Amino acid sequence: AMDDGVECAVCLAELEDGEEARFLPRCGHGFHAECVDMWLGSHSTCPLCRLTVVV
Ligand SMILES: [Zn+2]
Ligand SMILES: [Zn+2]
Secondary structure (H helix, E strand, O other): OOOOOOOOOOOOOOOOEOEOOEEOOOOOOEEOOOHHHHOOOOOOOOOOOOOOOOO
C-alpha cells in the first residue's frame, strides 16, 4: 500500500476514517486524538517534531 502519508508516531496506525486525529498548527503532523492524548501525559506538544500547539 502507499506507506507515505501521515503515520502516527505513537500507535503507527494508518489514520483511517472513524477516528479523531488531531493535527497541529506549527507543523500539521496529524496524530490520533487517543494516541496524541496518551502521548501528552506531560509533553503538551507535537509527538513527532515537538512543536507546541499553544502560543
Ligand atoms: Zn495512533
Ligand atoms: Zn509536528
